[PDB]
Amino acid sequence: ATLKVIGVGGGGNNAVNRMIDHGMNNVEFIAINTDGQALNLSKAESKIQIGEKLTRGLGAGANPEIGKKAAEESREQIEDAIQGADMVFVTSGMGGGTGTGAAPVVAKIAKEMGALTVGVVTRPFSFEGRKRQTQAAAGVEAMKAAVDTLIVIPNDRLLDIVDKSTPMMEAFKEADNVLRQGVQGISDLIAVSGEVNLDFADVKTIMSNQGSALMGIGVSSGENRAVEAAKKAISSPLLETSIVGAQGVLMNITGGESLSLFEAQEAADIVQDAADEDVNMIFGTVINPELQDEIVVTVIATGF
Numbered sequence: 601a602t603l604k605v606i607g608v609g610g611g612g613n614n615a616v617n618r619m620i621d622h623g624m625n626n627v628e629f630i631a632i633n634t635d636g637q638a639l640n641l642s643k644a645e646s647k648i649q650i651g652e653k654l655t656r657g658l659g660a661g662a663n664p665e666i667g668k669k670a671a672e673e674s675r676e677q678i679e680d681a682i683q684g685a686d687m688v689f690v691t692s693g694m695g696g697g698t699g700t701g702a703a704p705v706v707a708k709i710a711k712e713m714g715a716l717t718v719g720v721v722t723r724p725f726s727f728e729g730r731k732r733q734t735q736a737a738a739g740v741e742a743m744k745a746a747v748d749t750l751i752v753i754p755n756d757r758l759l760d761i762v763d764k765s766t767p768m769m770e771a772f773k774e775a776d777n778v779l780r781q782g783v784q785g786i787s788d789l790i791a792v793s794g795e796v797n798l799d800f801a802d803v804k805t806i807m808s809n810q811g812s813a814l815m816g817i818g819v820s821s822g823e824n825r826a827v828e829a830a831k832k833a834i835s836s837p838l839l840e841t842s843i844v845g846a847q848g849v850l851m852n853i854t855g856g857e858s859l860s861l862f863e864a865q866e867a868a869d870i871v872q873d874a875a876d877e878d879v880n881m882i883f884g885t886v887i888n889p890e891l892q893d894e895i896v897v898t899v900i901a902t903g904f
C-alpha cells in the first residue's frame with residue numbers, strides 16, 4: 601500500500617517540509633504550489649508547479665478561483681505524480697488563493713484515481729479577518745465534498761495551547777503532528793502483522809466515503825496506563841471534530857508482553873463511551889516485547 605503526502609499552497613508545503621525534516625520513511629512527498637519561489641525551496645522530492653500560465657510563478661493573491669483554475673490547468677501533471685497511490689494525504693491551509701482553490705481539486709483527482717483520500721486542513725486565525733475565514737469555509741466545504749475523510753485544524757486552537765512567549769513556529773509543529781502521527785500510524789499498521797491484526801482494508805472500511813474524521817494517539821505507562829493512553833488518543837485541544845458522536849472506530853493497542861485483556865477492555869470502553877454512540881469498532885492489538893512498560897493507543901474515528 602502506497603501512501604503519498606501532498607501539501608498544496610504555502611502552509612501545506614511548509615507542513616511537507618517539516619514532516620520531511622522529521623524523517624518520514626516509506627512515504628512519498630509531493631509539493632504543489634503556484635508560487636515557484638517557495639516550491640524551489642521545497643525538500644519534497646516530487647515538485648509540481650501549478651498555474652504557471654495563470655500566475656507567472658507567483659501565488660494566487662488570496663483569490664481561490666486562481667488556485668482552483670491553476671490546478672485544473674495542470675490536471676495531467678497532478679495525475680502523474682499521484683499515480684500508483686493507494687492512499688493520499690492532502691494537506692493545506694484554507695483561506696489563501698492556492699490551497700482553498702487547488703487543494704479540493706487535488707483531492708478530487710486523487711479519489712478519481714481510486715486512492716483513499718484524506719485531507720488535513722487548517723482554518724485561519726480569527727485575527728486574519730472575517731473575509732479570509734469565509735473563503736476558508738468555502739474551501740473546507742469543497743474539501744469535504746472531494747475527500748473520503750476530513751480533519752479540520754482551526755489555527756485558533758493553537759492559542760489554547762501556548763503561553764504568551766511560545767514561538768509561532770513551535771505552535772505550528774504542534775499542528776504538524778496531527779497529520780504526521782496519522783500517516784506514521786497508518787504506516788505501522790500496514791507494515792506489521794499484529795496478534796489481532798488490522799490492515800489497509802480495515803483502514804479503507806473506516807475512512808472511505810465518510811465525512812469528518814478524528815485521528816489520535818496516546819502514550820502512557822504506570823498504573824492507569826490503558827485508560828490514560830486512551831484518554832490522550834481522543835483528546836482534542838487542536839481538533840474541530842471531537843470524538844463525541846462517532847459511529848465507527850478503528851482502534852489499536854500496542855504494548856509489551858504484560859498487556860492484559862482487562863486493560864484493553866478499559867481502553868476500548870473509554871472510547872466507545874466518549875463517542876457516546878453505538879460505535880461499530882474494528883479492534884486490533886500489537887505485542888511489541890521491546891515496549892516493556894509503555895502502552896500506545898491509537899484511534900481513527902469517523903461516522904458522525
Ligand SMILES: Nc1nc2c(ncn2[C@@H]2O[C@H](COP(=O)(O)OP(=O)(O)O)[C@@H](O)[C@H]2O)c(=O)[nH]1
Nearest residue numbers: 609610611614693694695696697698699724725
Ligand atoms: N497552522 C499553519 N497554518 C498556516 C501555515 N502557513 C499558512 N497557514 C494558514 O493558511 C492560510 C493560507 O495561507 P497559505 O497556505 O500560505 O496561502 P496559499 O499558499 O495561497 O494557500 C493562512 O491564512 C494561514 O492561516 C503554517 O505553517 N501552519
Ligand SMILES: NC(=O)c1c(F)ccc(OCc2nc3cc(Cl)cnc3s2)c1F
Nearest residue numbers: 782785789792794797798816852884898
Ligand atoms: N493490529 C495491527 O495490525 C496493528 C499493528 F501491527 C501496528 C500498529 C497498529 O496501529 C498503528 C496506528 N497508529 C495510529 C495513529 C493515529 Cl494518529 C491513528 N491511527 C493509528 S493506527 C495496528 F493496528
Ligand SMILES: [Ca+2]
Nearest residue numbers: 789792793798
Ligand atoms: Ca498489519
